[PDB]
Amino acid sequence: GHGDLHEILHEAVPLDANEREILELKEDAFAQRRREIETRLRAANGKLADAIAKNPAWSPEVEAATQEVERAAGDLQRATLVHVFEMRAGLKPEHRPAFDRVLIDALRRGSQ
Amino acid sequence: GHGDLHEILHEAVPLDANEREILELKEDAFAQRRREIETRLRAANGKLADAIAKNPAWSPEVEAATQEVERAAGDLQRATLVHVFEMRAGLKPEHRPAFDRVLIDALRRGSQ
Numbered sequence: 001g002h003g004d005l006h007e008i009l010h011e012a013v014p015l016d017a018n019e020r021e022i023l024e025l026k027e028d029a030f031a032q033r034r035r036e037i038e039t040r041l042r043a044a045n046g047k048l049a050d051a052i053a054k055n056p057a058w059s060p061e062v063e064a065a066t067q068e069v070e071r072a073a074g075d076l077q078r079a080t081l082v083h084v085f086e087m088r089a090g091l092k093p094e095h096r097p098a099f100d101r102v103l104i105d106a107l108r109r110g111s112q
Numbered sequence: 113g114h115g116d117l118h119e120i121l122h123e124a125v126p127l128d129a130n131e132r133e134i135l136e137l138k139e140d141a142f143a144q145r146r147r148e149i150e151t152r153l154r155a156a157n158g159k160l161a162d163a164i165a166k167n168p169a170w171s172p173e174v175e176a177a178t179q180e181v182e183r184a185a186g187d188l189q190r191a192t193l194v195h196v197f198e199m200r201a202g203l204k205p206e207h208r209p210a211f212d213r214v215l216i217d218a219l220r221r222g223s224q
């Protein structure tokens with residue numbers, strides 16, 4: 001699948017009042033990081049489209065654009081999962097098992 | 113976005129009767145290849161979920177599962193685009209510009 005793992009967690013197992021206060025800095029830093037990597041992904045998609053518009057074949061331009069797309073997609077996947085673990089660190093310990101249930105099930109479905 | 117590039121092309125710019133005959137072998141070979149890589153992707157998602165169920169932290173198990181997911185996703189992206197170029201080769205030349213319009217626009221939106 002193509003689930004939004006971060007959104008799934010904040011909606012299904014929302015932070016409590018104190019957890020939200022504790023996590024606010026890291027949540028903002030993540031929002032900014034997600035936006036930056038998504039800007040890079042959109043730009044890489046544009047480069048791949050441009051390459052194929054110019055010459056619709058495998059090509060050095062296509063090879064480079066494909067790699068750039070892959071790299072940005074991987075950076076987003078990894079950054080998201082690191083932030084998911086940041087969230088888990090900021091939870092009261094007793095809230096972690098419910099969080100994990102949602103996380104495990106969503107990962108199995110391909111959410112990222 | 114998360115568009116299904118292959119499906120977008122076959123639906124918006126379907127093959128004509130003769131093109132469909134010419135392409136049938138390569139279309140079948142691609143269907144089988146897509147299914148194989150998707151099996152690997154689902155299995156990699158399962159390994160990542162398992163890893164995090166066991167120990168919800170970055171870990172050698174998470175590192176390996178994440179890489180396996182990335183590798184299968186890239187293999188699928190590349191195989192799809194190679195087959196898109198197979199399709200273009202099997203088109204009557206006069207049909208290629210319409211195909212390219214759909215392809216370029218869909219790539220720009222992130223379809224893969």
Ligand SMILES: [Cl-]
Nearest residue numbers: 010013014015
């Ligand atoms: Cl929340």
Ligand SMILES: [Cl-]
Nearest residue numbers: 094095097098
């Ligand atoms: Cl809990």
Ligand SMILES: [Cl-]
Nearest residue numbers: 122125126127
């Ligand atoms: Cl078709």
Ligand SMILES: [Cl-]
Nearest residue numbers: 206207209210
């Ligand atoms: Cl045309």
Ligand SMILES: [Co+2]
Nearest residue numbers: 006027083087
């Ligand atoms: Co968060």
Ligand SMILES: [Co+2]
Nearest residue numbers: 118139195199
């Ligand atoms: Co096809």
Ligand SMILES: [K+]
Nearest residue numbers: 077081111112
């Ligand atoms: K993930």
Ligand SMILES: [K+]
Nearest residue numbers: 189193223224
């Ligand atoms: K692509």
